[PDB]
Subunit: 244 residues, 3 copies
């Protein structure tokens, strides 16, 4: 469809300047835009498996949530060498929307907000990430929606009894670090995100913040599935999932 034109469409949904400080968003690996494309792949992470499987299926435009490299390099060996080899031989464009996709209207965090039908939801953090608002319902109803739609067996740190109509906070991905938990404990009764260390569990219990670990995977793939749908039913392309 011309890569240039797909990218411009994605940057219309998720403007690049929504990305948090130092987020490596946009064109990752690629020369020759203007080239038309057939199979557009979509994955969470540009792991080698995902890059291999994209060549195997003749994907010529890989879209990932997570950037290829977080930190810059000037030597190319080991794993990064193979990933680039496959991508450069096969002329497969690799593009990324990371936090700009987590932050935009109807992005990964809005999707969680909508799922739980949060009342008057606002961004959680100063950088635009996450969403917080009232869950009009009970904690048990919150748990059912979560078990149904996000993750079947979520770790629940029930640090406090939860009244109906509590403030629910959600963060798609890794959101349960010690400092994240302290911050959100000021602003919410229940916090739904991924990756609960043992220390964070204890911290949550001490502060009285109820935490639900739905894993970083399930909370990201929920909104990513949605973005895939929005893509294929807006573009005449043919679009595959590579790690769902």
């Amino acid at each position: 469809m011309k890569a240039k034109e797909i990218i411009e469409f994605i940057e219309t949904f998720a403007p690049k300047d929504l990305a948090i400080e130092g987020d490596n968003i946009g064109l990752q690996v690629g020369d020759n835009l203007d080239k038309e494309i057939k199979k557009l792949g979509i994955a969470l992470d540009p792991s080698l498996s995902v890059i291999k499987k994209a060549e195997k299926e003749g994907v010529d435009f890989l879209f990932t949530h997570h950037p290829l490299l977080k930190d810059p390099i000037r030597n190319f060996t080991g794993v990064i060498y193979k990933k680039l080899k496959i991508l450069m031989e096969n002329d497969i464009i690799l593009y990324s929307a990371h936090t700009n996709l987590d932050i935009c209207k109807n992005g990964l965090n809005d999707a969680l907000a909508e799922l739980y039908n949060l009342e008057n939801p606002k961004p959680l953090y100063d950088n635009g990430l996450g969403r917080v608002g009232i869950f009009k319902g009970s904690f048990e109803e919150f748990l059912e929606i979560t078990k149904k739609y996000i993750h079947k067996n979520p770790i629940v740190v029930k640090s406090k009894e939860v009244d109906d109509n509590f403030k629910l906070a959600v963060l798609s991905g890794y959101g349960l670090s010690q400092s994240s938990i302290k911050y959100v404990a000021e602003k919410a009764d229940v916090y739904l995100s991924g990756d609960l260390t043992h220390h964070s569990k204890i911290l949550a219990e001490e502060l009285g913040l109820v935490v639900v670990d739905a894993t970083h995977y399930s909370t990201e793939v929920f909104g990513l599935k949605k973005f895939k749908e929005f893509l294929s039913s807006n573009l005449d392309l043919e679009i595959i999932s590579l790690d769902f």
Copy 2:
């Protein structure tokens, strides 16, 4: 009246230590604070026009909201040379109360909060700037007050619906940078401030924050007018505005 004493009065209303980190407040240019003062000028800005006009109208004490220099210098040429020449040649004192006037009780942000009759108003930012509270009324009633008392045709970024009794955030001056907007969006449904950039507009629509740009000038001058009157009523001394 005498210069020492006008300053003392101004600092009683707006104590210097209210000023945010790094703000150049207080005496800008002047050598003899015992100098009796016959005419006092007030301006938003110590512009060359304001300064020329001050000298031409025989102003011997010039008060400005904005300081002469944000960033220190060690060479004097061009515009700053011309400004200092006029102030020094005519022994016009130049004095500023900047953010301390924005932050103090009845100062520039209180003036806005009071206008909109905000319910249980509180400071917006960690540094004391801005006010946020509940506007007991409809979005419509709010716009009308804006158009009538602040600025006739404000650009409105109406990202989605605003219910009555919404959280209204106000900031006198330049309040619509990207980081400000991300921050206020956590705290308010509506944001009234000045100087909106195209990128900030997009950000507000993405985040769901309703923004009303009334210009930095209009939002500052409203409170400056109040500060002028308050000075008139308490001081026997001719007082003119040079800037508005």
Copy 3:
């Protein structure tokens, strides 16, 4: 009971990672943690008086809220010499739980929250410190509770009329710096803490925050008494308070 066991108990109640960045918590002075402890002393502060008193009374394990040193040294003279000499000659162990005892469930801040029976209390600051919630009652009832259970004559900065069912912020210790006040003013109608500076007073008046200074001693010692009793109840040793 061995020293490492008492320490392990304390750290169960107040885990070390609860402490704010840079806080010097844990073993202050001591070498032999297998030491059988017969007499536990407890104090707000490892002052020279307290360390002398502890030796006079055969204390072999000294717990203090405040650390011995906040900033590191590499020279040993004056007061710090006299302190360490006593601790070392008598192999008295000195151990501290500082902000971790402030932040933990039923720690110093929670004790305040519980006393005023705050409605849905939450941590006040990003780092876990302080509690804030609704005081179900009048400003007057709130003062009677203060006067009776914390400090007899608290200084009150009545910056504003306070309605019933106000948002009350509590911070055990020194919470009344200018930056703390600007911040709490965003979040509360009334701030109960200790050690009010003159500039902080004016600042609170300007912003409309009602401040009650019950001193840093009285707000800390209240929770410390609870933790003493708790240490008595659980551990079997005799426990004397050297500071209160």
